[PDB]
């Protein structure tokens, strides 16, 4: 029996009309959605554009050159034995490239959400008025009004506007670009000499090459999330809690996606099955989505005018079939259909893909077959929301339901099950390879240091666009934490000058800490924090869920920040939900404050609380 | 039904808009001006990303010093201070790098097939009902190929830099075109004249776009009728031998002083009438034969014409293959386009489309054709795709209706005669000094010219970065010299060069950084085979190990100018003699090296693995 949600849905009027077929040479025919995966010309053009964006921001020549510098920095961290990140090994270098790019995009998205919270909290009175006065308008229209009363940097919710507002660092990672020119299948036969091991360390196995050719990261902008967050929000606190709840789920999926590459298994590929010789009025489509950043998959079937879907777990497969247990059913889907198979990479999460599938199922009678095909493929392949305003709102309402506490899917249960299954796979693959080949060969190809995106020791390069009296400001957001333990932070600063005086500022709820290091080309430890099982830390006597680090350098060239956990495979923290975020509230308004290194005296350095300063002039104490 | 090819639109020839069948219909990229504009912009972006005009201008001075340091004889020196030679070097260097990378990927594919020849032979023999594309997937999975997709989308994702087709208009941007001297034989005036190209070379570049075929394209025609692994490998080498010879001819057309023709489409001036007709004229710059395709109604006709031996009155030469009556005097709008497929690939689809002329709609015929010519996008109709690959093999095989060796030879003789005629004409008009500036006699063919190939290294062994260069195969016979230039941040460094043969390798240690250093001198006979330490070889692998490297360049130079050609090998020539390339994969670790390890050592001396230390 298909799952039936009693969600209220707006009526949908199709462009095709009562006869459910568009007329030739009409304005509606020109604005109709059309398939992108099925059409070869579009599926080729979009891959080329996706590759171009990756090479613009991340150049292989630059990343190959920075390997020597990055290896030295990781060595200088002085990690314990068994926790060292050796970038001289090819597999470790390849995994670091994937990890560093994925973390930078996740960090930037988290940074923008933090600023968006600050603008909402500053304008709480106006925001509260909008939410309660305007409850009948569409979710997209509510987002436009909310982004206007607050002085948001990105005030556009349209797809074209979001693309323009997005900058380098949030571009999805194109997997095939990373794994280009890397040697595969180096063969040393029964040799344990140092020369043979050196050659062995320079190559990767075929499995990692296959994993990278099927990888494409998904990072959701805050402007995308504000529409689901404001569908039923009544107060500003509820809206902020919804925004934080969604990004908590999103971040947890990103860590799982990186964990898939670390294990020795190959990741499945999303594909579409179409008839070999399509016949008019007898066509059918089958869509199989294996999201890399997720714990659940989707199978959608379009036979006639009927839409049927199934949600299957990506863990526990016996290798006899590519589908796990079914968690939510929406009809009967036949995955044994015979036809041409087309491979694609999804640009939306499982929660986003399912929301449109539920909305489309309710609109099957009111929408033509072509509209269902066009709207689904555009969103899966290009993250393009449907132009039908009523259908778009229905998708956002379902998106809120799948994330709320009353979701039909228990996301926490499935995410935890996926972590346990992935850990077992790594042990099985390592043990199997430890028998067939040596322990040394097993360590090269399956490193134990790389576990998940927010556990492995990773670096994040900082970009600087703000200059205060000659000092460039580099910003890094410490936290939030999905793992508990002891975490160390280090900063690497490269400057053209021979001798340089650079400063670091750590901002909390009440006061900030200012440090001076004056050491170049070597990591310098700035902060050591202890995170409890609830993900909060005690920074100068108060509980903090996140902090802000600002680095000031004169004539800077590159500033890197290293994040390090004391023990490998740090225990995880249960993912926060809406109730958890509402219960405890932290003020982030102080992250906007800045200091001027040039006008700094010796007494101003150290830990100082806000009451010691005047309004403004946070550099100099009274 | 009777027809194996089924049109997306039924016999009614009507498909409702907004339906799945209409969504997957092919698009006329050439005829649509929105589609043509978009393709050109993406192509220019890809070229500008990998090759930067601001970078090539900066590297001009460094390259000029290296070319002079080769100490070439008088009459064979390459002078990059002259603008004409620099522009020709820019086009040639990128052309040769793309061909070099394609050849390297072919050698890896051959090694992979030979490692699993038992499984490959089973696939080829047992399974014959599946299409060419399906057969390629199974072969590319049985062998552990790095690239396992034959789909156009997967190919573009895994194509990588260095194989991107050269964009002529980007190269020709910003170069001075008109300089007058007005009877001034002076050092200052001659220096000024050497800074500008002439109008003829500008027009040549604006109609230039190279075509480089990936081994994943070649595999589908190769395996379409192959029954054994040897036949599959022999077919792969035969196709690439034809491609390399055509690629050489493409560069020679820029060296000789005449304007190359531009491919165009003629469509009726009035759009949306009853009468529908289209004429396509394809002038492949990388070839010796052209194609003229005419579609009036549902009738398709083609004519293959020679691109050589043509008077100024008519652009078309003699017709070497006929497929109907084509009228090239039709009047209408002319839209110029750049073909992205070879003449054989274009001809293969034309034969397949003619067979299914009445089984497909006109929009399907046009969309499938234009997508292939302008995007190298294979038709989605699987039945149509299979027939095209069968014709591609036939056009390459020994039973080809076209004698490719005869036409390629005539093109070479015709181009040489044109260079002599143009040089003599300008010598009388202006003088010897001016004529040499504009028509350099040192360039000639692509694989005859002294050229450099910048190397990219992604493999580091114990802090030493490996740069791989494949020596050969050679289409000319004579004496060849190879040199290596190493730019390293360290003031003093030691770098190693290794040359892998069938039985043993040669280890060389060098110290000189910025000046080129000669690594290997070889003699190649009329069969394109060299004797490297008592064993006949068709190609060798050169690996350079440099610590903290910034750039590594390899210079190829022939002792004599205009080296005589070697007859292009065919399928029968490739299966006759077999060479083993499985040894091109093994590496050495320069860090763990001793004085006794350097030199020429056979495999017997080494252990299993440990190709560094000579103790068995």
């Amino acid at each position: 029996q298909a799952y039936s949600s009693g969600l209220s849905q707006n009526s949908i009027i199709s462009l095709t009309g009562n006869d459910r077929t568009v007329a030739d040479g009409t304005f509606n025919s020109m604005i109709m959605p059309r398939a992108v995966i099925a059409n070869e010309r579009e599926h080729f053009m979009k891959t080329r554009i996706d590759k171009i964006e990756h090479d613009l921001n991340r150049s292989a020549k630059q990343e190959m050159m920075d390997r020597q510098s990055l290896a030295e920095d990781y060595n200088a961290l002085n990690l314990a034995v068994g926790q060292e990140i050796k970038l001289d090994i090819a597999t470790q270098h390849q995994l670091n490239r994937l990890g560093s790019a994925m973390y930078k995009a996740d960090h930037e998205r988290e940074t923008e959400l933090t600023d968006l919270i600050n603008r909402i909290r500053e304008n709480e009175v106006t925001v509260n008025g909008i939410l309660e006065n305007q409850k009948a308008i569409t979710a997209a229209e509510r987002a436009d009004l909310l982004l206007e009363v607050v002085a948001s940097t990105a005030k556009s919710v349209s797809a074209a506007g979001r693309a323009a507002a997005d900058g380098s660092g949030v571009v999805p990672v194109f997997g095939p670009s990373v794994a280009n020119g890397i040697k595969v299948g180096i063969d040393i036969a029964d040799s344990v000499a140092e020369a043979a091991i050196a050659v062995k360390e320079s190559g990767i196995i075929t499995q990692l090459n296959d994993v990278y050719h099927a990888f494409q990261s998904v990072h959701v902008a805050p402007n995308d999330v504000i529409k689901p967050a404001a569908v039923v929000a009544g107060t500003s606190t509820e809206l902020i809690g919804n925004l934080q709840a969604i990004y908590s789920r999103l971040r947890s999926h990103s860590d799982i996606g990186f964990k898939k590459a670390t294990v020795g298994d190959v990741i499945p590929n999303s594909y579409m099955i179409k008839p070999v010789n399509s016949t008019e009025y007898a066509s059918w489509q089958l869509y199989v989505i294996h999201p890399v950043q997720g714990s659940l998959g989707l199978v959608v079937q379009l036979m006639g005018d009927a839409l049927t879907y199934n949600v299957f777990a990506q863990y526990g497969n016996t290798s006899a079939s590519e589908f796990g247990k079914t968690v939510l059913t929406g009809g009967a889907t036949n995955t044994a259909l015979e036809g041409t198979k087309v491979k694609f990479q999804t640009k939306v999460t499982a929660q986003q893909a399912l929301a449109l599938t539920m909305a489309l199922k309710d609109a099957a009678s009111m929408l033509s077959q072509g509209e269902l095909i066009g709207y689904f493929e555009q969103y899966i392949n290009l993250a393009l929301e449907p132009d039908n305003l009523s259908l778009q709102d229905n998708m956002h309402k379902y998106h809120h339901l799948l994330t709320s506490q009353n979701s039909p899917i228990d996301w926490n249960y499935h995410d935890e099950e996926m972590h346990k299954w992935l850990d077992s796979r790594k042990t099985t693959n390592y043990d199997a390879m430890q028998k067939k080949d040596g322990t040394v060969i097993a360590d090269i190809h399956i490193p134990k240091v790389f576990n998940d995106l927010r556990n492995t020791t990773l670096h994040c390069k900082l970009e600087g666009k703000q200059t205060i009296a000659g000092y460039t400001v580099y910003e890094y957001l410490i936290g939030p934490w999905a793992h508990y333990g002891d975490i160390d932070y280090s900063v690497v600063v490269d400057t053209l000058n021979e001798e340089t005086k650079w400063y670091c500022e750590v901002i909390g709820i009440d006061g900030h800490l200012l440090i001076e290091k004056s050491v170049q080309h070597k990591p310098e430890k700035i902060l050591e924090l202890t995170v409890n099982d609830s993900g909060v830390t005690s920074f100068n006597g108060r509980n903090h869920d996140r902090l802000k680090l600002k680095v000031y350098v004169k004539d800077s060239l590159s500033v890197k920040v290293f994040r390090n956990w004391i023990g490998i495979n740090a225990p995880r923290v249960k993912t926060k939900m809406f109730n958890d975020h509402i219960g405890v509230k932290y003020d982030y308004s102080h992250f906007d404050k800045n200091i001027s290194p040039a006008h700094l005296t010796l007494t101003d350095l150290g830990w100082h609380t806000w009451d010691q300063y005047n309004a403004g002039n946070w550099t100099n104490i009274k | 039904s009777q027809n194996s090819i089924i049109s997306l639109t039924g016999n009614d020839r009507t498909v409702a808009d907004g339906t799945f069948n209409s969504m997957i219909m092919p698009r006329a990229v050439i005829a649509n001006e929105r589609e043509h504009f978009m393709k050109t912009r993406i192509d220019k972006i890809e070229h500008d990303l990998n090759r930067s005009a601001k970078q090539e201008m900066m590297d001009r001075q460094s390259l000029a010093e290296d070319y002079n340091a080769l100490n070439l004889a008088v009459g064979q020196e390459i002078k990059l201070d002259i603008a004409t030679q620099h522009q020709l070097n820019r086009l040639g260097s990128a052309m040769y790098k793309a061909d070099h990378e394609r050849e390297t990927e072919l050698t890896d594919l051959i090694n992979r097939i030979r490692e699993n020849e038992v499984t490959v032979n089973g696939i080829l023999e047992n399974q014959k009902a599946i299409t060419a594309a399906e057969r390629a997937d199974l072969l590319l999975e049985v062998v552990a190929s790095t690239a396992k997709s034959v789909s156009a989308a997967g190919r573009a994702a895994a194509d990588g830099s260095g194989v991107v087709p050269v964009f002529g208009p980007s190269v020709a941007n910003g170069i001075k075109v008109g300089i007058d001297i007005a009877d001034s034989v002076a050092e200052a005036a001659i220096a000024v004249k050497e800074s500008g190209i002439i109008t003829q070379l500008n027009d040549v570049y604006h109609a230039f776009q190279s075509v480089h075929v990936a081994p994943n394209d070649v595999i589908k025609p190769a395996a379409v009728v192959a029954g054994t692994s040897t036949e599959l490998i022999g077919n792969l080498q035969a196709i690439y031998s034809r491609l390399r010879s055509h690629s050489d001819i493409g560069f020679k057309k820029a060296t000789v002083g005449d304007v190359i023709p531009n491919s165009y489409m003629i469509k009726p001036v009035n759009s949306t009438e009853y009468a529908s007709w289209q004429l396509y004229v394809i002038h492949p710059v990388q070839g010796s034969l052209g194609l003229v395709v005419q579609l009036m109604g549902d009738a398709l006709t083609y004519n293959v014409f020679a691109q050589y031996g043509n008077t100024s009155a008519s652009e078309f030469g003699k017709t070497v293959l006929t497929g109907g009556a084509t009228n090239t005097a039709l009047e209408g709008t002319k839209v110029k386009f750049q073909t992205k497929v070879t003449a054989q690939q274009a001809l293969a689809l034309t034969m397949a489309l003619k067979d299914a002329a009445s089984m497909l709609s006109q929009g399907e015929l046009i969309g499938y054709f234009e997508q292939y010519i302008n995007l190298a996008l294979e038709p989605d109709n699987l039945s149509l795709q299979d027939n095209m690959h069968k014709y591609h093999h036939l056009l390459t095989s020994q039973n080809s209706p076209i004698d490719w060796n005869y036409h390629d030879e005539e093109m070479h003789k015709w181009l040489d005669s044109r260079k002599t005629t143009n040089y003599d004409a300008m010598q009388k008009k202006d003088g010897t000094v001016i004529a040499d500036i504009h028509i350099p006699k040192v360039f000639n063919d692509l694989r005859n010219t002294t050229l450099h190939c910048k190397l990219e290294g992604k493999q580091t062994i114990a802090g030493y970065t490996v740069y791989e260069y494949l020596i050969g195969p050679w289409a000319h016979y004579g004496d060849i010299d190879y040199s290596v230039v190493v730019d390293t941040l360290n003031e003093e460094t030691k770098w190693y060069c290794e040359v892998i043969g069938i039985d043993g390798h040669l280890l060389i240690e060098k110290s000189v950084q910025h000046k080129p250093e000669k690594i290997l001198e070889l003699t190649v006979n009329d069969s394109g085979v060299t004797s490297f330490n008592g064993r006949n070889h068709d190609r060798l692998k050169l690996k350079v190990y440099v610590k903290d490297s910034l750039s590594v360049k390899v210079f190829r130079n022939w002792i004599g100018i205009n080296a005589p050609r070697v007859k292009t090998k065919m399928f029968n020539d490739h299966i006759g003699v077999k060479y083993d390339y499985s040894h091109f994969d093994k590496n050495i670790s320069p860090a763990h090296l001793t004085l006794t390890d350097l030199g020429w050592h056979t495999w017997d001396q080494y252990n299993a693995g440990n190709w560094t230390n000579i103790k068995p």
């Binding site: 630059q62 920075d66 510098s69 490269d494 053209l496 080309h521 060239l557 590159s558 | 941040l489 360290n490």
Partner: peptide
């Protein structure tokens, strides 16, 4: 400028 090139150029000058 890469961090590798900057460190190498700094060493040469010093």
């Amino acid at each position: 400028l890469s961090e590798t090139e900057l460190r190498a150029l700094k060493k040469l000058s010093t």
